[PDB]
Design a protein around this ligand. Structure first.
Ligand SMILES: Cc1cc2nc3c(=O)[nH]c(=O)nc-3n(C[C@H](O)[C@H](O)[C@H](O)COP(=O)(O)OP(=O)(O)OC[C@H]3O[C@@H](n4cnc5c(N)ncnc54)[C@H](O)[C@@H]3O)c2cc1C
Ligand SMILES: Cc1cc2nc3c(=O)[nH]c(=O)nc-3n(C[C@H](O)[C@H](O)[C@H](O)COP(=O)(O)OP(=O)(O)OC[C@H]3O[C@@H](n4cnc5c(N)ncnc54)[C@H](O)[C@@H]3O)c2cc1C
Ligand SMILES: Cc1cc2nc3c(=O)[nH]c(=O)nc-3n(C[C@H](O)[C@H](O)[C@H](O)COP(=O)(O)OP(=O)(O)OC[C@H]3O[C@@H](n4cnc5c(N)ncnc54)[C@H](O)[C@@H]3O)c2cc1C
Lengths: 540, 540, 540
């Protein structure tokens, strides 16, 4: 079978084909080469856009208020050479084909993520209501977990035509894909993942306890409870495009992606001398934080940094979490329509915490001979810690444990997790193996950021659709043209890096178009097919 | 008309009748008079329980980790006599008849709260997507508001038999109320208020805008969007018992209720000398914060305070937000069943902010000669402030403005609200009337609180039901008897003080029962009718 | 002997006589009655000035950014009626005759403070280097303490003519006082209290251990180590005017002083209707925080509050800690001479912490029969706590303990003190007696404040002298006249409330003078004698 990819459903454009075609993304009239475009944010969406716009012969000017890379952030443990904790995104589904274009272009290595019940994990432990279940494969788990898995598979088949949608994604059958998906949009926009579960016949036939299990740990590979309040459409998108499985980690830390894009010399650029990179063009560093964006009296856009320095541009792309545009960035009211402002004000963000320790070796691989069990496993629980992941860097290098994912000082956070993990594994001495420093993150603190990523709110498809289409500007008044937005808040998969890359590439098409440029006839880009296969607009 | 009171629907017991009966609440055998019972928390739930158990001849020992009153908290502005800002609860629906029992006992005065479109408010302004609507009566508003109003009424009437339930409430007809309510519980437990509105016929045939207005400002009396994620059963309870209307403020500040209960000499009391109050029994102050609760080897409960002092009690009642029992307070595992632990672990809390200024006089009552509009009104908006309240203390006295009630230093909070109000009232100089200090509160920022109050989660009716029933301990193993819980998270109306009072009175019943007491035959209490009319248990 | 008072040495003006004389402080021409004078700060210096200027027929307009009373701040423990912890100043030497004028005028009660080795304290314990010394009177202490006391008495006699200065203060012999003091000013301005100790023959003849004792606990009544880095002149002033002994507490909390001044009706006011008070004149509350002071184009002074409200005044008195004028308050550069700005920029502040608990009764009064010792005493130590004070509110009301004075959360601060006090008193159970809530303060946090009070820096007499004389404005250019400063940073006794009151009364004379007013011939005020007996100016 042809692979599942993040191909629609909302906009089934082949971003991958577009990036891979030998013709390139398009061209800008040479009279405009060298002109500047401001890009606010040096996370993956800002840098992908800057890189491709550099290749088209413009001079991107990246601004960054905090650290290069944004929410792709990898921290080395003290003393070590490349043993990292992932502070932002860490598990990248292979269906993320536009993201992996850049990973592959940089020649970075990836490996399978140690998810429960996969080849990359030896064993799993589920701890619920004080009972522990050990499993080396899914069939080791008690029947109740398979019942949960069947009820979920049946709910998605009955409720959303999961099988048909996946096949149309595999085949890239756009007409069929849009027919299946567009039926679901007005049905499920207004309804939570809570409501999908509670009105599905398959979950209704199971005991309450089964629905609880499903929220805490799913069928044994990860719970759903943090997603229950969100729009069911968001959950459909996730599961239909395999975001939630077949995931890889980037060896040496995914921060190498935006750091490598910064430094990478394209083989072929319009206008620039051979050897040019984003880094070259900038004299080595992005500009500082943006505090104001305004329309200048010459009709160009005015961008003022934190220190009062104000520079003019024909186009500005903002990739900070989009709610900062309403408060933090003083962005001139005439720059967005009233309805765009309303969509921008309404975004809400989910919060997350992860704490990592380093260990001297992957001791979890040892066997307890009184039981046959690994000393420790990928752990899913209803307790504090929720999920614990084990990273085997090889038998004779340090391991890393993500002691706690979930949705006090570092020292207290780690002690609380080790106490909970002692309840679950009363015979294993985890503490004894820990070395170096603990690394903790909460995205909340710092800001600059509002949360790990947005939670798609029921009833907000209309706002999402207006923001997603913002790059299509032929019909907008001249006072609203020339500013562009991208990043994972803009995208249909807000928790997943491929959303940030796809919306970024839509913005690249938009900006190219803005400068009088166009795609090559044999390699059309997002704005060439958007009106025909773009996301449906709902009435009112 | 017989009034609507907070009489069920889940537990339709007349707590008001039980308090007002001249027989009193019951009695405990003389041999047990003077024995101590620990009460953790000196909010309204802890003090009402302490008060009534003192009357029955016990020696309550109240512990308080922060301030007396809990979330009933009233702060005076600098240098004034009796001019207050209400930091916790401020508007108390007169359906709250058990709370008002204590307000009245203490001879406190109340007045109508200045809610929009009521006689206590002269005018309202609604400000939505950049447009302003002035109204001195509901009919001044454009037709969109009356359509939302009719839709909500039709939705409740159609989907929940609201008219019939309210009539059963007014009549105190228990069999009819339970028949109407019990049918709703399994239908709506696991659906959100989002889902209820979206799927209702009456909103489903109106434009998107109508639902959006409903979320932001309702039909002109306050928006509902902060309750959208909650179980629809919670919202039924609130509207069916009139929690959201006919509200009064306590003159001089609602904190006088718990401070007064503390000092009040009861009109009858077993065991204690004439003139005894909670305050005299305690020698003036509650004990400090509790750190640990455990079962001692003599079979009693051991309560260890923050400074390590340990004391034994035959019963302990806890009234802090009940999730603290899982974390801040080290509460011995064997004290709750596994199922009670699971209910306790699951509660989640809503967050709140309010900022108040004092003004020199009630200037908003001045007319603008031009437009005929008040200078300022009760203001509902989609802007940051969300709601602004105006408190008239008489023409010759300072006024108070609640500048923002929504769901940062104080100076930046006030400045940002004044900037939003300038956008709405570009001709009114609010700033020029402000005197004294700005008073703000965020409940989350204090560590003895997790939020303003819980939000009821879809699907948690089974947990709610088990925690509400925990005071009924005939069927429990010995090791789980003698500890009790009460407070607003325990109740069916978790954002309303009447829930804290009613759950506290169930606990009083349970504690009197624990000490071998009982109610008088002519005044039965909650535990005497619970098994028959208490809330329905759902099956697995 | 006639009593020691805070009478000079630097400006030996009888503030007390001036306040007490039946003529009053002076008068302003009636044509200026009712005109406004801005006063920034509602601590004791702002309110004393406002009160007296109201009496002269002006309309003071008090501004307050934080809480009325400033660093006189008394907090009731929860549940109690008037059992207070003192958060600011708590021990007021009776030599503070201008401060006590207001205490007496308000009819507040005072009582002796429980200082070590005084009639108000039963016993003292000194704990040093792990040895404990118990004493009910000074002679119980080992010889080493009397040796320290003699060496200090001899150092002050030899080095500073302590005896002669005290006699000239008792007699109020101004010529002699100024002759003795003015010799010391240039000698000791540049030298620390460190240096005075290390070059004195009396300390040189003692072992090192004796000098250490002196810094930690003095001769048994309080150590000096926190004062060692300061200008020796400041220490002279303190000891010569008995600031450091014969101290009283204000019953019910010293915050009653500025709160009572706010509400007090003078018997005799110029201009105002009978019954006028500061509170009346203000409609009940001071204005909010000041953010800007500027010179207006009409020549008057412009005062802008935090909310942008800007009002004009003929005169402004600022009493916030004076360093806020340089940063926080945007105060126009033309308002102060260059040399005044320099004096204002150079002030530095000392930091302090105090933690208080309430206890059920004054248990410390109980005797240990195995030893004859009180269970607990006023405790001086080199450990964390430094000093612990015991407040006996009567055998049958709660006691208060100041567990820790010295120069983490509250819970941790109290635990750390109880642990240290367990080392010292291994047999006493303090914890068991503690009730209510702990009250802690650090002045640092909040700001508004820079520290508890300024530390007089060696070599800064010239800056102190210019700021002290700032109220004398006949010789200043018209652009620098009309603004005035007062408060304890301005005063010669920065750690002591009488400094704030004296500089305030100098400002009252200044402002009166500014409005064309004068003192009565038979009751001359500070500015009438300042040029003749004011603080010496040093050359350069
Ligand atoms: C906890 C967590 C786990 C995740 N897990 C995964 C995962 O498993 N798989 C996956 O695919 N994805 C995951 N993601 C998502 C992926 O990390 C994001 O989708 C992606 O990194 C966001 O990229 P971006 O360019 O949209 O935004 P960002 O990375 O946020 O970049 C925006 C940049 O703008 C900067 N900025 C903000 N304000 C200003 C200003 N005023 N001026 C200048 N610059 C400014 C910010 O500092 C930031 O660097 C995860 C994210 C988080 C937080
Ligand atoms: C922002 C806000 C607005 C509100 N609006 C309204 C309204 O309009 N109408 C209405 O009817 N109700 C309103 N309420 C609700 C009402 O205020 C609360 O329901 C009621 O006050 C809760 O009382 P309680 O006794 O349950 O809990 P609390 O008042 O929280 O009392 C519990 C006490 O336990 C103490 N404590 C915590 N931990 C410990 C420990 N370890 N040891 C000892 N003590 C401890 C806490 O300090 C607290 O004082 C509002 C509440 C808030 C926060
Ligand atoms: C820890 C401690 C212990 C002490 N011990 C003693 C003692 O034992 N004996 C003794 O005699 N004295 C003692 N003192 C000193 C006495 O408390 C002070 O000398 C006196 O209270 C200071 O009075 P003030 O009016 O100069 O200043 P404050 O009391 O500081 O009043 C200044 C006011 O200005 C306000 N303000 C600041 N900025 C602004 C603005 N922008 N706009 C408007 N208002 C503003 C502040 O909020 C404050 O209320 C002690 C002080 C401290 C801190």
């Amino acid at each position: 079978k042809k692979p599942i990819t993040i191909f629609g459903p909302d906009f089934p454009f082949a971003f991958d084909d577009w990036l891979e075609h030998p013709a390139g993304l398009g061209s800008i009239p040479a009279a405009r080469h060298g002109e500047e475009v401001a890009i606010v944010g040096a996370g993956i969406a800002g840098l992908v856009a800057a890189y491709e716009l550099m290749k088209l012969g413009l001079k991107p000017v990246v601004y960054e208020a905090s650290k290069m890379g944004g929410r792709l952030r990898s921290q080395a443990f003290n003393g070590t050479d490349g043993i990292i904790a992932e502070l932002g995104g860490m598990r990248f589904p292979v269906s993320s084909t536009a993201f992996y274009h850049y990973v592959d272009k940089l020649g970075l290595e990836t490996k399978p993520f140690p998810n429960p019940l996969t080849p990359a994990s030896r064993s799993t432990v589920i701890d619920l209501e004080g009972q522990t279940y050990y499993a080396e494969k899914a069939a080791d788990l008690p029947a109740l977990f398979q019942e949960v898995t069947d009820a979920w598979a049946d709910a998605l088949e009955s409720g959303a035509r999961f099988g048909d949608i996946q096949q149309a994604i595999r085949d890239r059958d756009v007409p069929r894909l849009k027919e299946l998906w567009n039926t679901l949009v007005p049905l499920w926009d207004d309804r939570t993942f809570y409501d999908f579960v509670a009105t599905s016949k398959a979950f209704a036939k199971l005991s309450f306890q089964h629905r609880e299990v499903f929220g805490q740990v799913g069928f044994g590979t990860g719970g759903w409870d943090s997603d229950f309040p969100n729009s069911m459409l968001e959950i459909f998108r996730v599961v239909m495009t395999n975001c939630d499985d077949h995931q890889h980690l980037v060896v040496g830390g995914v921060e190498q992606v935006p750091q490598g894009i910064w430094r990478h010399v394209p083989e072929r650029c319009a206008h620039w001398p051979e050897g040019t990179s984003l880094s070259s063009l900038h004299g080595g560093a992005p500009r500082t934080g943006v505090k104001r964006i305004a329309r200048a009296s010459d009709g160009r856009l005015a961008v003022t940094d934190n220190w009062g320095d104000c520079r003019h541009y024909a186009a500005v792309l903002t990739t900070c979490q989009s709610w900062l545009l309403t408060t933090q960035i003083d962005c001139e009211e005439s720059l967005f329509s009233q309805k765009m402002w309303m969509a921008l004000d309404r975004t809400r963000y989910m919060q997350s915490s992860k704490t990592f320790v380093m260990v001297d070796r992957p001791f979890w691989k040892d066997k307890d001979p009184e039981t046959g069990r690994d000393l420790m496993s990928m752990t899913l629980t209803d307790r504090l810690t929720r999920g614990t992941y084990l990273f085997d860097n090889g038998d004779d290098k340090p391991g890393v444990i993500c002691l706690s994912y979930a949705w006090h000082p570092v020292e207290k956070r780690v002690q609380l997790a080790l106490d909970a993990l002692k309840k679950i594994y009363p015979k294993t001495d985890i503490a004894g193996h820990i070395i170096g420093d603990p690394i903790t993150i909460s995205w909340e603190a710092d800001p600059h950021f509002l949360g790990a990523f947005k939670g798609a709110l029921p009833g907000h498809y209309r706002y999402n659709q207006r923001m997603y289409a913002h790059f299509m500007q032929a019909q907008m008044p001249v006072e609203q043209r020339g500013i562009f937005i991208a990043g994972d808040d803009v995208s249909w998969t807000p928790a997943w890096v491929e959303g940030a890359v796809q919306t970024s590439l839509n913005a690249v098409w938009g900006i190219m178009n803005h400068f009088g440029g166009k795609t090559h006839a044999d390699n059309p880009g997002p704005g060439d097919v958007f009106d025909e296969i773009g996301q449906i607009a709902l009435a009112d």
